[PDB]
Amino acid sequence: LFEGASTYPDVDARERLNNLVGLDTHKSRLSKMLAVLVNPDGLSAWAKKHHPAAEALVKNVIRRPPLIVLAGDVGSGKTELAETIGDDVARRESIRITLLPLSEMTQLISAAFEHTVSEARKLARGAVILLVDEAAGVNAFIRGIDRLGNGALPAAVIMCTNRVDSLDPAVRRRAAEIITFDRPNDAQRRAVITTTLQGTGVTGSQIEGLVAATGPADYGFTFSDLTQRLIPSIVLDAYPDTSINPARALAIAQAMAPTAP
Amino acid sequence: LFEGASTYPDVDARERLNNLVGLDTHKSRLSKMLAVLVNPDGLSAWAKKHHPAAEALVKNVIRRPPLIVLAGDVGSGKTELAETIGDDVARRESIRITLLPLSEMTQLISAAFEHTVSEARKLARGAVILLVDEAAGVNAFIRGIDRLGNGALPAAVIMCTNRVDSLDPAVRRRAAEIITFDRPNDAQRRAVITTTLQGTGVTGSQIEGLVAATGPADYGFTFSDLTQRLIPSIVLDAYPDTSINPARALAIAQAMAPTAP
Amino acid sequence: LFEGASTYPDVDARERLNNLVGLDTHKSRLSKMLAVLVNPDGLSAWAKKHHPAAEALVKNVIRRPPLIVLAGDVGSGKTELAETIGDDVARRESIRITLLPLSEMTQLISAAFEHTVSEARKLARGAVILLVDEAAGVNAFIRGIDRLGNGALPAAVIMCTNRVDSLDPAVRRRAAEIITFDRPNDAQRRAVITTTLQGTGVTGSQIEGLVAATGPADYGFTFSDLTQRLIPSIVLDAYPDTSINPARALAIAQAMAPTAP
Amino acid sequence: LFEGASTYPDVDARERLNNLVGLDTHKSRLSKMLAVLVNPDGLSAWAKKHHPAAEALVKNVIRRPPLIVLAGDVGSGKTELAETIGDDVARRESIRITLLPLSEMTQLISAAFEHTVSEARKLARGAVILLVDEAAGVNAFIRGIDRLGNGALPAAVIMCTNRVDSLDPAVRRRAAEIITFDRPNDAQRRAVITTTLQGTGVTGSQIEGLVAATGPADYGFTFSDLTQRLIPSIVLDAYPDTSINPARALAIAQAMAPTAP
Amino acid sequence: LFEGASTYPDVDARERLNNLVGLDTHKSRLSKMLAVLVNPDGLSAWAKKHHPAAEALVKNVIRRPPLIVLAGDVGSGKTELAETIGDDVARRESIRITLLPLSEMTQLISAAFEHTVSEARKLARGAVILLVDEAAGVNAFIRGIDRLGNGALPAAVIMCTNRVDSLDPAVRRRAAEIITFDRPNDAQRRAVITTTLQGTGVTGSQIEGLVAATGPADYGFTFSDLTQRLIPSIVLDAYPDTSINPARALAIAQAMAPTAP
Amino acid sequence: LFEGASTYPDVDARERLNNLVGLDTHKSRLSKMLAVLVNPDGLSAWAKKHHPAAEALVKNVIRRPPLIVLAGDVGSGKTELAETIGDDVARRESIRITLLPLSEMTQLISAAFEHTVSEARKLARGAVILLVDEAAGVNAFIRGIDRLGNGALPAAVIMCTNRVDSLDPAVRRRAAEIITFDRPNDAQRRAVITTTLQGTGVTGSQIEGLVAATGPADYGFTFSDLTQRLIPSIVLDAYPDTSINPARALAIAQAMAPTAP
Asked: Exposed (0-12), middle (13-18) or buried (19+): which is E117, by Cβ within 10 Å?
């Protein structure tokens, strides 16, 4: 057993993906890297059509072990992104995708990789994503990743960590890509705020004030500070008898201090 | 068993809530978020009446797992707020509320969540608040929170922590809202001081001096520094044979150093 | 058993209290808070006579659990103050006071609190002070404090700690008052120096030099630096064949470096 | 047993070596030092032909125990370099080279060194490289290194570490050479970027912008930041329907923050 | 048993005391405090003859528990001072003094204190010094100190520690005096250098250069840096065929870096 | 047993000593201090011939326990110096010297000291050096050192440590001399570079550039940075087909970053 396996495409995953705001770049990179890892021919074909004289442009990208690391601040949506991104990959490559979430550790890791290899052999018609929410056992994991990379099996591994320095170096150096979730920049803060406040009549000038109030002005808000503190506070301040007040929303953002690093 | 369960509304909880000063914003956010978690229709109805064209305004707020984190300085009143806020929620939603305070840990957490689910099924006529004063066991807690969120059961979890970084990331990322208790700003210091000094003849100009003396001028007083050090010192300085002296109260505030971070 | 129980008033406690210099404010606050905790009516009566319109002035002070925390630098006299202050409380309230000093920990704490409750029931004619020199067991202590607070029993707890951050948060948040012992300010340094040097012919101008030499000029002397280093050095420098020399006393103070934080 | 032994020359090692960019200096030093350790006569002959009057020029280099330490940032390619560099040494000295990768620890280290000595005796027609990926056992390792150094056996040891301070001092002081992998300088960043972007039509002026955007401007990108984050992001941004856009590549580099030390 | 007990006066202790340079103030304070602890009447008599109107001048000094703490940098001579200072006390008070050096810990401490009490009862004709070179057991030590203080027994305790913060607070607060050994000031550096260089023809101007070269100019030499590094280096530089050269001595002092804090 | 005992003089030790560059001062101090410890009469005789009126000039140096501490950066050559310096002492005093290198710890230390005492009694015709490469057992070591010091036995102890603060204080305070190996100053860097580059045609002006490039300009190269990184890199850069190029040597030194403290 594993945990709760999901297949893609999925209406609920798509809805959850859509609800992630300010992560558009992280979505695109995670989705496209996964597509390359399971179907590397698509990257080779893109290279030939657009840059045929390119010698090392993709040579580095293709041969990487099929592991993607999501690293950064807690509460940024890393896990929620990893659990739903397979819907995007399924759309992008037009394949059906089985997600295996990994919930004595050495036995568990081996088993997970053995199952992943077996299912990938049965399947490029489809693909298999192994998801690891943590964190002898490191060696079982390394051997598993290498085994997926040695073969042409349509399989990839996503692993989430709060701090990339927590990861064993032999795991880190095998990541085909590391995607970082640090404090949102002005554009990312703008997207979360605009998307959330749409249809409330908040002007663009008032949005920029909240963008500035949540920036470093010297560290800014985390993604968590926006989604789990500031957004609820703004909504609840008006609920249930009042419309959203930009002056109060700004006063809330300014009095609120960011999570310290 | 749990500890000492309370039902709301309660005269003593209301009195205790009222005695919490400088926490008006924390009370409102905690009370309203809890109301939304147990009765999400009220937020949807508010959205339609005031912002019908809003697409993602509340979509994020409603679907959150029903967990609220109170994080920040020790002695701010977090626990006292969590133990009494159910009286406010009962008033706001006109419901009767059962509070279950959580006092081998994995068994305890499972049992608490199983009981909470059962009682919530019996009950939206009423609601059930599970309170956690801390801090395998993390997994039991996560499974419990998800189970409350999966259902439409009128139940929520409050948990208090001194530092949010202490919390397991898989707990933190599930908080529907994080409410922070850091050092009171000038308005919050003014409210504690004014409310406490009311009827003593202290002028507003003298209140502002004490507000300034307890601010960063570079960190200011904590809530604890106001309620457990400065307020007793001011009162005891006059007790039992003298009226309150603003000059002495200011001298006390200025000589007193804030709790270091 | 406990340790060595003392009754108040006591000639030796009074003498020891008197020998504590530079702690006049700490004595007054500790003594008056204890009087309020055992005889809360005296605070209510003071409030009515002097500030009858005051609504929340004492409402916060009275309802606090009967615990007082003494926190700060080692060697400041915290323990010596806690062991003798009951003589002051006995004088202030005209009551006889039994001090129980607390010297498997969970059993010890429960027993101490059970004994304290029993003796307080026998006794407001008198009062009982439980003294804790440190530091499951935390839970026994919390339950004990709440039990003393729930009743009208004339009993209070004093506990000493070097750093208040060492204390469990559930202990800290129950303190009715926290009294801090940090580095003496210019007035406190003046009182120790003047009182010690009285009758030696040291001028006030020479006292101010020693006050300045022991200040931050950027941290100053601790109370320990004054009583366990500088004062002996000044006396021994003259002993046994010479009178006290202000020039040498200043040279000693200036060459002596304060205890680093 | 060991792990997976490789012989050199090898087409796949050569390909992997070639794919390492920005490490040209590290390759040359590692390759040449290894050649000297197995065939010290070549260094003596070079010294005589070019600097015959040199007395201590090579006297220090030759007599060193045959250990080379690769130290520095995770994900720089240290391991990949150590696993393939034997192809370069084989070419440089025209010898066949057996690589023994080292996967109860004291027994393992002794055995590895005993095997290495035996094979080196059979073999200067060829050479033996012992590779150590980590990290009583330290003593077995020291004894092994000394034993290789005492003899004229054509054998050397490569060991990789993230931080050289992690290594036992008795290991560190025996390194014939320490080769460091820290943050690439402007030339090294230029080589990675130019080599990767060749044939995409990116101008030299646009390359310099990306060199500047990945420098300290105050720490710069690591090698990992270039190969596992920035390079994939640039490629995936265009893939699969668009050619590489220098403006987007610069915007990506600038918004991306380096790995903190 | 203990270790090696010494009686005073002793020719070898006197010689060792004399060889300690730059500690004149520490010697005087340690010697005089010990004399007061064993013969407190001498301090009272001094007070009456010189400052009869002094009320609290010595009241604090006399009543202290008979413990003296020597705290500060390793290699300052603290231990050597504590092991020989009894010769000075014997001279100052004209008494014979038995030193008991303290080499399951709780039993050892109790026994040492029981023996010390017994011998002090037999003895003010003489006195007993207990010496502790470190560092349940803390409680045995506290009980021992209090027992010596409660009685009029002619006995004192010296304990040495590198950092006073290492000591248990209940030990620290009982010290009658704390004597600190930190980095020598200009006068102390002058005394070590002058005394050592006497009879070598080094001018006073050249001594001041070495005083300046060993000062902070921002921390200066420790006592260890003078006695265990600089002094040997200066002597050995001339030994065995050359006289002491002030220019070389200065060059040595300046190139030598102080021990970092 | 011990490890591998060496006798002096030794041709190989002399060669190894000669190969240590930039340590001339450390060699002289270590060699001369050892000579004094085994033959203290030579220091007394030097004092009389050159400074007969000197009273405390050597009184401090002679009476020290016979222990010398070598402390500082790893890879400076401390161990190599300690293992070969006995050849210098043998030459300086014209004696034959037995070196005992120390490879359940309490038994080992006692045995080593008992053997050292026995051999020294058999031997001033000769001397015995005990060498300790690290680091109850501390007490065995202290007792051993004192025993060597109490007697007139021609024996000394050398111990090496990376950080002197690692040593037990009771060991540190017994060192007759502490000799420190920190980052080479400009003269020491000049000697390593000049000696290594002799006969290569590198000008003095080019040497000064490399001296400046390896200095703090704010910490400079360690001895390890010179001998295990920069020197190999300079040589290997020319090997095997090119003469040494000062321009390349400078470029290498400047791009190379020192080991961080």
From this structure: middle
CB C95, CB C31: distance < 8 Å: no
Experimental method: X-ray
Could you give the CA distance from residue F143 to residue F128 in angstroms, rounded to a whole number? 17
Q: Are A177 and A31 within 8 A, CB to CB?
A: no
DSSP letter, residue A256 = S
Distances (CA, A) of C187 to A60, C23, C178, C218, C255: 72, 11, 21, 17, 22
What is the SS3 assignment for E99? strand
Distance CA F89, CA F124 (A): 13
A130-149 residues touching B, CB cutoff 8 A: 133
Closest CA to F227 of F17, F20, F25: F20
Most C CBs within 10 Å, among B73, B235, B243, B244, to test the C interface: B235
Does an interface of 3+ CB pairs under 8 Å exist between E and F? yes
Classify the C-alpha dihedral E132-E134-E135-E140 as positive or negative. negative
Which of A56, A164, A185 is nearest residue D255 as measured by Cβ atoms? A185
How far apart, in Å, are the Cα atoms of A251 and each of A233, B176, B180, E57? 11, 22, 16, 59
Give me Rg for the CA atoms of chain C.
Answer: 21
Q: Which of A41, A46, A59 to substitute to test the interface with D, most D CBs within 10 Å? A: A46
Cβ contact C81:C97 at 8 Å: no
Nearest to F252 by CA among F240, F237, F260, F239: F237
Within 8 A by CB and 6+ apart from C191, the residues are C21, C22, C24
Would you put residue C57 in left (φ > 0), alpha (ψ -120 to 50) or beta? Answer: alpha
In degrees, to the nearest 5, what angle opens at C-alpha E102 toward C-alphas E99 and E103?
Answer: 130
- Closest of D175, D169, D184 to residue D214, by C-alpha: D184
User: How far is it, in rounded angstroms, from Cα B38 to Cα B57?
Assistant: 19
Tokens of D81: 């370099």
Long-range contacts of A52-57 (CB under 8 A, 24+ apart): A52/D199, A53/D198, A53/D199, A54/D198, A54/D199, A54/D200, A55/D198, A55/D199, A56/D19, A56/D21, A56/D195, A56/D196, A56/D198, A57/D196, A57/D197, A57/D198, A57/D199, A57/D200, A57/D235
Helix/strand/coil percent split, chain C, to 5: 55, 15, 35
Q: Position D91: which residue type?
A: R
Q: How far apart (Å, rounded) are the C-alpha atoms in residues C115 and C112?
A: 5
The C-alpha atoms of residue F60 and residue D123 are separated, in whole angstroms, by 60
The candidate with the shortest Cα–Cα distance to A229, out of A258, A188, A191, A189, is: A258
Name which of C20, F112, E72, C54 is nearest B200 in CA terms.
C54
E225, E227, E229, E233: CA torsion to nearest 10: 140
B64: its two tokens: 């959150």
Radius of gyration of chain D, Cα coordinates, nearest whole angstrom? 21
What is d(CA C159, CA C83) in angstroms, rounded to the nearest whole number?
11
* Cα separation, D259 vs D219, whole angstroms: 9
HEC profile of E187-254 = HHHHHHHHHHHCCCCCCHHHHHHHHHHCCCCCCCCCHHHHHHHHHHHHHHHHCCCCCCCHHHHHHHHH
CA distance B153 to A211: 36
Query: At E37, which amino acid appears?
Result: L
| Secondary structure tally for chain D: helices H, strands E | 13, 6
**Angstrom distances, CA of residue D112 to CA of D39, D152, D212:** 22, 18, 46
Query: For F30, what's the count of Cα atoms within 13 Å in the CB-facing half-sphere?
Result: 30
Tell how far CA C162 is from the center of its chain. Answer: 12
- How deeply is D122 buried, as exposed, middle or buried, from its count of CB atoms within 10 A (0-12, 13-18, 19+)? exposed
Say how far apart CA F261 and CA F253 lie, in whole Å.
18
C195 in contact with E at a CB cutoff of 8 Å? yes
